[PDB]
Design an enzyme around this catalytic site. Sequence first.
Site, mmCIF file in Angstrom:
data_model
loop_
_atom_site.group_PDB
_atom_site.id
_atom_site.type_symbol
_atom_site.label_atom_id
_atom_site.label_comp_id
_atom_site.label_asym_id
_atom_site.label_seq_id
_atom_site.Cartn_x
_atom_site.Cartn_y
_atom_site.Cartn_z
ATOM 1 N N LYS A 149 -9.185 13.979 4.123
ATOM 2 C CA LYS A 149 -8.267 12.830 4.140
ATOM 3 C C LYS A 149 -7.380 12.980 5.388
ATOM 4 O O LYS A 149 -7.437 14.046 6.017
ATOM 5 C CB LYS A 149 -7.355 12.824 2.918
ATOM 6 C CG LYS A 149 -6.616 14.139 2.578
ATOM 7 C CD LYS A 149 -6.934 14.347 1.115
ATOM 8 C CE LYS A 149 -6.146 13.444 0.201
ATOM 9 N NZ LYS A 149 -6.845 12.938 -0.953
ATOM 10 N N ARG A 150 -6.559 12.016 5.832
ATOM 11 C CA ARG A 150 -5.741 12.202 7.026
ATOM 12 C C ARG A 150 -4.726 13.315 6.835
ATOM 13 O O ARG A 150 -4.206 13.457 5.724
ATOM 14 C CB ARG A 150 -4.970 10.941 7.380
ATOM 15 C CG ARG A 150 -5.810 9.827 7.971
ATOM 16 C CD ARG A 150 -6.326 10.230 9.336
ATOM 17 N NE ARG A 150 -6.113 9.183 10.337
ATOM 18 C CZ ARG A 150 -5.033 9.174 11.144
ATOM 19 N NH1 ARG A 150 -4.098 10.155 11.072
ATOM 20 N NH2 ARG A 150 -4.902 8.168 12.012
ATOM 21 N N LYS A 165 0.304 14.772 1.718
ATOM 22 C CA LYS A 165 -1.044 14.883 1.178
ATOM 23 C C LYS A 165 -1.294 16.309 0.715
ATOM 24 O O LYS A 165 -2.246 16.538 -0.030
ATOM 25 C CB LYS A 165 -2.039 14.472 2.272
ATOM 26 C CG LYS A 165 -1.908 13.028 2.805
ATOM 27 C CD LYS A 165 -3.165 12.261 2.486
ATOM 28 C CE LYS A 165 -3.170 10.827 2.975
ATOM 29 N NZ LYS A 165 -3.396 9.831 1.911
ATOM 30 N N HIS A 203 0.807 -1.191 0.000
ATOM 31 C CA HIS A 203 0.000 0.000 0.000
ATOM 32 C C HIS A 203 0.843 1.244 0.000
ATOM 33 O O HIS A 203 0.251 2.291 -0.195
ATOM 34 C CB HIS A 203 -0.918 0.038 1.225
ATOM 35 C CG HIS A 203 -2.104 -0.911 1.163
ATOM 36 N ND1 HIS A 203 -3.305 -0.630 0.704
ATOM 37 C CD2 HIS A 203 -2.134 -2.224 1.550
ATOM 38 C CE1 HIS A 203 -4.083 -1.708 0.778
ATOM 39 N NE2 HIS A 203 -3.343 -2.655 1.288
ATOM 40 N N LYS A 221 -14.461 8.392 -4.908
ATOM 41 C CA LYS A 221 -15.773 8.612 -4.319
ATOM 42 C C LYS A 221 -16.419 9.913 -4.750
ATOM 43 O O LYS A 221 -17.636 10.054 -4.865
ATOM 44 C CB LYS A 221 -15.653 8.617 -2.817
ATOM 45 C CG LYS A 221 -15.068 7.348 -2.230
ATOM 46 C CD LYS A 221 -14.680 7.647 -0.761
ATOM 47 C CE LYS A 221 -13.848 6.529 -0.162
ATOM 48 N NZ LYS A 221 -13.496 7.093 1.122
ATOM 49 N N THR A 259 -8.463 6.620 -2.546
ATOM 50 C CA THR A 259 -9.764 6.109 -2.978
ATOM 51 C C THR A 259 -10.866 7.168 -2.798
ATOM 52 O O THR A 259 -11.962 7.171 -3.407
ATOM 53 C CB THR A 259 -10.042 4.814 -2.179
ATOM 54 O OG1 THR A 259 -9.707 5.039 -0.824
ATOM 55 C CG2 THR A 259 -9.295 3.636 -2.792
HETATM 56 O O1 LIG Z 1 -4.603 3.867 4.774
HETATM 57 P P1 LIG Z 1 -3.953 5.095 4.205
HETATM 58 O O2 LIG Z 1 -2.546 5.312 4.650
HETATM 59 O O3 LIG Z 1 -4.860 6.300 4.308
HETATM 60 O O4 LIG Z 1 -3.814 4.786 2.659
HETATM 61 C C1 LIG Z 1 -2.894 3.949 2.007
HETATM 62 O O5 LIG Z 1 -3.594 2.812 1.396
HETATM 63 C C2 LIG Z 1 -4.674 3.203 0.570
HETATM 64 C C3 LIG Z 1 -5.491 1.978 0.159
HETATM 65 O O6 LIG Z 1 -4.730 1.174 -0.726
HETATM 66 C C4 LIG Z 1 -4.056 3.989 -0.601
HETATM 67 O O7 LIG Z 1 -5.096 4.470 -1.456
HETATM 68 C C5 LIG Z 1 -3.183 5.144 -0.089
HETATM 69 O O8 LIG Z 1 -2.579 5.633 -1.268
HETATM 70 C C6 LIG Z 1 -2.133 4.786 0.946
HETATM 71 F F1 LIG Z 1 -1.464 5.895 1.441
HETATM 72 C C1 LIG Z 2 -12.213 7.025 1.562
HETATM 73 C C2 LIG Z 2 -11.769 7.445 2.960
HETATM 74 C C3 LIG Z 2 -10.439 7.742 3.204
HETATM 75 C C4 LIG Z 2 -9.402 7.739 2.064
HETATM 76 O O1 LIG Z 2 -9.119 9.069 1.573
HETATM 77 P P1 LIG Z 2 -7.919 9.405 0.615
HETATM 78 O O2 LIG Z 2 -8.100 10.797 0.149
HETATM 79 O O3 LIG Z 2 -7.754 8.324 -0.355
HETATM 80 O O4 LIG Z 2 -6.633 9.309 1.536
HETATM 81 C C5 LIG Z 2 -10.065 8.218 4.415
HETATM 82 N N1 LIG Z 2 -10.998 8.409 5.386
HETATM 83 C C6 LIG Z 2 -12.310 8.130 5.132
HETATM 84 C C7 LIG Z 2 -13.340 8.385 6.170
HETATM 85 C C8 LIG Z 2 -12.702 7.655 3.929
HETATM 86 O O5 LIG Z 2 -14.044 7.638 3.631
#
Ligand SMILES: O=P(O)(O)O[C@H]1O[C@H](CO)[C@@H](O)[C@H](O)[C@H]1F
Ligand SMILES: *Cc1c(COP(=O)(O)O)cnc(C)c1O
Lengths: 833, 833
Positions: A559-560, A565, A368, A671, A667
């Site tokens: 996102k986190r 990021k 990942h 969405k 991901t």
């Molecule tokens: O769980 P986090 O760290 O948010 O996410 C990690 O794994 C997800 C799912 O494969 C990836 O899309 C992301 O690029 C990576 F950084």
């Molecule tokens: C989909 C999802 C993520 C993933 O977000 P990215 O922008 O791919 O890092 C993180 N947190 C929540 C609550 C999600 O729904």
Amino acid sequence: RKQISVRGLAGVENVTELKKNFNRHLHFTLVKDRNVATPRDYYFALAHTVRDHLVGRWIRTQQHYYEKDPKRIYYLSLEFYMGRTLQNTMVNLALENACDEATYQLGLDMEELEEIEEDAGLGNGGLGRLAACFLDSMATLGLAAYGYGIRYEFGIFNQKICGGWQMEEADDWLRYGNPWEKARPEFTLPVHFYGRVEHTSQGAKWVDTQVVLAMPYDTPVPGYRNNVVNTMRLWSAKAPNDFNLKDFNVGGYIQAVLDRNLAENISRVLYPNDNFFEGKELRLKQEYFVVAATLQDIIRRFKSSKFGCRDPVRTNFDAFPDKVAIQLNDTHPSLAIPELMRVLVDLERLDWDKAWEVTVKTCAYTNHTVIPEALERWPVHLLETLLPRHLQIIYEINQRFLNRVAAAFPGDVDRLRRMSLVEEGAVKRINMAHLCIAGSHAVNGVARIHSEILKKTIFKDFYELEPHKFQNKTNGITPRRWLVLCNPGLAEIIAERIGEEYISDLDQLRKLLSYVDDEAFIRDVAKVKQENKLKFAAYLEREYKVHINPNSLFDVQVKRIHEYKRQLLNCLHVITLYNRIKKEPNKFVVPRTVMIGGKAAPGYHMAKMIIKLITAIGDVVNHDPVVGDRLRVIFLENYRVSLAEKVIPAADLSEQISTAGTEASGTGNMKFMLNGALTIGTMDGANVEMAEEAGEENFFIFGMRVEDVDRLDQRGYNAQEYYDRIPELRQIIEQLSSGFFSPKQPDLFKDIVNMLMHHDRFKVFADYEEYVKCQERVSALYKNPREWTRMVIRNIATSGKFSSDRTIAQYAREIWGVEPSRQRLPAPDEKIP
Amino acid sequence: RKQISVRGLAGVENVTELKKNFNRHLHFTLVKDRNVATPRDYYFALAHTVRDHLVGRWIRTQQHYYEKDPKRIYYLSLEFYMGRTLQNTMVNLALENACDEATYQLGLDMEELEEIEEDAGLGNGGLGRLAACFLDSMATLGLAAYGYGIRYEFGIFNQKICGGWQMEEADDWLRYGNPWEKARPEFTLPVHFYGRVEHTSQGAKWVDTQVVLAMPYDTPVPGYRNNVVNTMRLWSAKAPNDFNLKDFNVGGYIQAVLDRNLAENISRVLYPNDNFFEGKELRLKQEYFVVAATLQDIIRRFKSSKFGCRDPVRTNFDAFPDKVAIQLNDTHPSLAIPELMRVLVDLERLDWDKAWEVTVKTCAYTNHTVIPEALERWPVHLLETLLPRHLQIIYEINQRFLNRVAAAFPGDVDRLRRMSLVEEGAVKRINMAHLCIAGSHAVNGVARIHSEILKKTIFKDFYELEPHKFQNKTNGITPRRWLVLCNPGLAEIIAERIGEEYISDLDQLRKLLSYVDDEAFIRDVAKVKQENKLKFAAYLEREYKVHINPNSLFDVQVKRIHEYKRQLLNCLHVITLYNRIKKEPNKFVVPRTVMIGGKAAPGYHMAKMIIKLITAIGDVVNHDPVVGDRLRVIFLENYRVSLAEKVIPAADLSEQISTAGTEASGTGNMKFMLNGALTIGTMDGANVEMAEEAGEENFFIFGMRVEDVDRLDQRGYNAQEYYDRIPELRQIIEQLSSGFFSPKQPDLFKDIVNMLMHHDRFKVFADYEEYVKCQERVSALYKNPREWTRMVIRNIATSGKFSSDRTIAQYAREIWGVEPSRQRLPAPDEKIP
Ligand SMILES: O=P(O)(O)O[C@H]1O[C@H](CO)[C@@H](O)[C@H](O)[C@H]1F
Ligand SMILES: *Cc1c(COP(=O)(O)O)cnc(C)c1O
Ligand SMILES: O=P(O)(O)O[C@H]1O[C@H](CO)[C@@H](O)[C@H](O)[C@H]1F
Ligand SMILES: O=P(O)(O)O[C@H]1O[C@H](CO)[C@@H](O)[C@H](O)[C@H]1F
Ligand SMILES: O=P(O)(O)O[C@H]1O[C@H](CO)[C@@H](O)[C@H](O)[C@H]1F
Ligand SMILES: *Cc1c(COP(=O)(O)O)cnc(C)c1O
């Protein structure tokens, strides 16, 4: 405001049947009556009435696999980010509308009750949500698949902003109970820790271990309308009764009992870290605990299969890969590999060489990330204390592996120190990603660049040794939560033109391209987005007071909070906007509400400092009178799955701004594309395949591509060059440095200025020019509304590739060796045999 | 073997209704199906189907009291020894036979399922079982009463004998769930600890306290066939979310979460001590925690009553004693008293003098012992750390109390130091029994000698100051568990002659005297006892292998192992028996199986040494060939309520052998009298009232009376005098001293010889002659069987006084001010209003 939608049928006998079972559970289950029940009791009475429709299917899906005995998929992951389970169970069961009716017909509002359910927050971000979207798709595609993990008592912390600072608090999500799990204490298993290896007569035995017991809890996972309900089995740690009590010769009775929650601490809390690695003993114990108990359940089901009868017999573990596939979600379950070897060699008595051919053929690994500090490299002194036999297996695996390498690349002695699963250094460590590539038959990345980078950079030595192993499977999102359930309005207007088969065949969305010039479709797509913006602006005003203008571009990054990021590059843009209208107050600018939300791991000082910059920009901007309502900055508190189902439909612009080559996939970007938002993003991870799918003209790409990032690093990133050449950028750095955004305490952001200026790992200044340029191009399009909605219709109509039903049909076919299916399993019906 | 009995009706529609609901819960609740359910699943499906018949009554009993608004009784106790709940709920609900039928008609055996239920072991012995028999009688007598306590996760340890030694293990009774409680997390309350008192402007405030939350779980308590189902509410400790997490400036996120079970430790375990006192902080925290949360529930229900409307209004706490009575079971909830004062003075703003008149009129105290080390005298430094405001209330209560004393007995300065609630000494302590007598309006002992001793010895100073306070209420046992449910055979043959109204009017048993000469009754009473002996001899052979002869006198002592209970004097007798037939092998002696069972507190070395003597005597006796089957000694493992329901019906002889003046009551002696066993006992506690009720001729009293014990202590107990004068006794002491009973390790019992000889607090040798004499008189009667059964018919027919319905009708009337009732509450029926 209103709805009817095609959330299924509300048929006569069924709305009646439901109301009755709702009143039953309020009385018999809740032991509450009508004059004293609160919205929470009303929520549980519906939650139990909806799980009643699920158990018949669950029972028969599980006995059905026992009878046909498929190859079974085990998705092992330390995170599963489920969110709430009511509405989704209603969607997949076709019960949305009958329960809506029944609840209305009983005086309550479904949406009130649905908001009472607490999110199962057993995940940090992307990887954990991926696991949850996979379970949905594995059930929808009728696979005999099982998600396995830890039942954490405290999932990810609830974030609170106090004085602009993140404040973390425990997610006591089971305070009120969980109507969806079923404890199964009759199936508890021991998991051994510590101990010794005695070598005698025939083999090693792991002796004098401490025992922890694994208690499972099964949550049902219903596929979308096919009567398959699969199982997520989450383990809880439980102390034994004798050892966690008897060992005597004084040391307190009461103490021995109070010290049991010390062994039960292995499932107490989810480790809160997005893309980092904590080498903590509690963590390796959680990782061994889920591997250990899971593999005993795996072997158990294999020993019955039908071999526990015949098929051949004379325990031909030979057929074990033709009956089991285990998917390692990251290196967190990598001990699946010396543990499967351990049972097979030590306990089951196969020869090493038979047991290695059986291990590689059943295991597979999903990688990942690329960022080097996310990599698990557990120090040897930890593994020899805690798991002395598995370290011993990992040194013999390592040995035989490098003997293949040296045979294949003779004389190449630096390759040998690079491929080794044992990292010498001050602290000698085990490289778990290396274990995984050595003992898996398939390795994959989560997006086409990410998978190309593994072959080309991070695991090139491994690709040259076994090229056949490396694969790609681009991530996806489930069309059921991420469209049918957070956006019923957008799903009905699509279903009005093209029907409903797209919910399990999202590639059908392409038939929507025909309507890009249909003025009825352009107005409906546009009416749904304005509706969602008004419903979220009200949410904002209600639950959190704030008041934003629904007639602005809703610019959102959720996102986190990590440096890669780039929440800082977005901040640099909103301060620019602020300053361009401070110099020309009376220029019309397209007004935008910019919303940034996400969690910071607790001791990641930069992330916590970035949340304080964002709330600090909002304190100025949101209170300037010359700005008016034209610009507002909103920090979105406690981002989690249920808040993502609220914001992402209200989004106009999606910020997918990572330095190219750092986001493996993402991901959230997907969405946001199925829900009518447009993407501004770098060519990173899956943003590349997404723009390739919608056409680059329908996407707002800017910035440095990875090639350019390598050239900048050969050259040397000097951030002072961007400061010297860009005055709008010079000015922001000086406003951060002089206390403009932190008056009462001026030096407050100099950590962030020093970093941007001297230690920027992620090149924020290099993408700054092209990004404020690109941001002028989206505002230009927003103010010509019908051409925005047409670009939006071209993104929505091209989301099909990004469904997890496609990703899982590709794991099924090219890694696990199963064919997917959609043929609904026989109707739930009765029959106790 | 067989039964039908009058365990109620098995009516057509009801056996059908039950079978259906059994199959429902196996499917929907258990999510098990017929081909995979175990006896435990079958047990839970019946357990849920029986609680379904209870909820309608519970709901309407609780709303019924809200509407008529009685004075409500709160029985606060730190122990509630419930045992299993299925059969008892069936008995009281009239469902025994319909579920028996239904279960048979579905292929299972009720008794198998009933043995699967784990005992709720939340009690140590007598006081805890008393609380449990009281709840039954308070519901049967239709009182609005509530038992309140702690929901301990680990009740009393399970005892295992390993190599003749007690081995203790955790009672993880909730491993499998509890079908009877209903968690009520919506009613959680805070309980404060530590803190400070700031005195400002108007009063004290307790400030900077740490907060623990109290989560309640309600268990229904059904009366015997009157449709009243009352509530036992047990508190669980839960850590808050903010304080048990936020207080910041570094100290680990994961640590702050793992440290919550540190606050949740207050309900982790029952303190395992029969008649002793542990001055441990965990214990005072458990005692404050149940007082605190309970009193908030009390005040809450009082504030609604109907005063929260009017009745008068202008919060006349004046009527608080005419609406609430709280019963302190021992001094364990004595902080009920400074806590009721604290809320009333500090929080509610009444004057001290109004709030003291309200406190004494609502509180009452039951004293359960005389032995000086059972007395709680908590050290001041504990109370000032943990509860600084309540110590402060206890010093002002103390002050005003002794000012009454000195006014009443002027000049009597030693009285003053004797009555003080503050014990000076090295460690200054608070005498909690004194608190209780000062702030209760009624004080009572648990048997007529025990209540006379309090007035005459231990609390004479207090009786002379307030004679009106001291009362007596002799203990009782519930005729429903302790006769109808452990002895259905003896209850049907009584019900055949005199009918069933005796089950709630046990004084009717006296009409059985008419049958003492009825040869049909003598043979039936005798057939029931032989049946019970065969069913228990089989149990023994099954569950624990052992094999005993059912044609012997079953001599049994079952109770906690304490020196005052005198398991050693019984041991001295069985060794005598052994030796009298070793000298004359071929003399016929009446054969007896002697069974001693009970738990030792874990660090009470004498008790653990007495269990090792008993298993050591059985190792010799049980393997001597000259003894044959004539004498066997059996140590009864893991004595608890459900084992008492097995052994006590199989008993022929009950050993109630305490040194006169040490057992306050005893209630095991009563259980054994309703079940056709004869008593050999000293004139102690309630054995005195029991023999006065059956006539001393129908009882086998021996030994020293309390007068004689005081003469022996004036004189000086010299145990060497009994050794010198009694050769059969000389010989036993020497067999213990020379390793006869411990060969491989000869000195093993010299702790016990040194004690008997030099430090016998309980005079074992003084009662030895009269006791082996008396024991020759019961063997003489046993071998004339029809005159034994006639003595037995005179004991059974005179058990009526010893029912808890009489004890509770006397607390109701002479302490609480309520009239009991038996008028059944309206039929369970439906009606949701
Ligand atoms: O769980 P986090 O760290 O948010 O996410 C990690 O794994 C997800 C799912 O494969 C990836 O899309 C992301 O690029 C990576 F950084
Ligand atoms: C989909 C999802 C993520 C993933 O977000 P990215 O922008 O791919 O890092 C993180 N947190 C929540 C609550 C999600 O729904
Ligand atoms: O763990 P396994 O045996 O696969 O599955 C378990 O749970 C399922 C779902 O109710 C039962 O049908 C099965 O008999 C039980 F044993
Ligand atoms: O604690 P109180 O309010 O007395 O009692 C509580 O439980 C009872 C029993 O179901 C309910 O009827 C009542 O409304 C509820 F609030
Ligand atoms: O709880 P334990 O200590 O067994 O028992 C104590 O209280 C009970 C109940 O009042 C008395 O019968 C007994 O005499 C006393 F010792
Ligand atoms: C009744 C009971 C007791 C009380 O026995 P005594 O002989 O009065 O001390 C103790 N334990 C259990 C299990 C009981 O049933």
